[PDB]
Amino acid sequence: GRGREFMSNLKEKLSGVKEKMKNS
């Protein structure tokens, strides 16, 4: 599931991406 395993992982990463994203 290129989308099934991506939708979940997405939010899982977004929680960390904000570390450098929202920062920069």
Side-chain angles (χ1 to χ4, degrees), residues 10-24:
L10 192 94
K11 225 233 156 74
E12 290 180 29
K13 221 92 122 178
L14 296 155
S15 144
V17 83
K18 274 178 153 219
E19 174 183 313
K20 310 292 292 196
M21 168 183 250
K22 210 199 166 260
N23 189 323
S24 194

Side-chain angles (χ1 to χ4, degrees), residues 1-14:
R2 63 260 263 159
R4 302 211 120 192
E5 201 164 329
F6 177 70
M7 54 189 279
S8 184
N9 181 57
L10 192 94
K11 225 233 156 74
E12 290 180 29
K13 221 92 122 178
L14 296 155

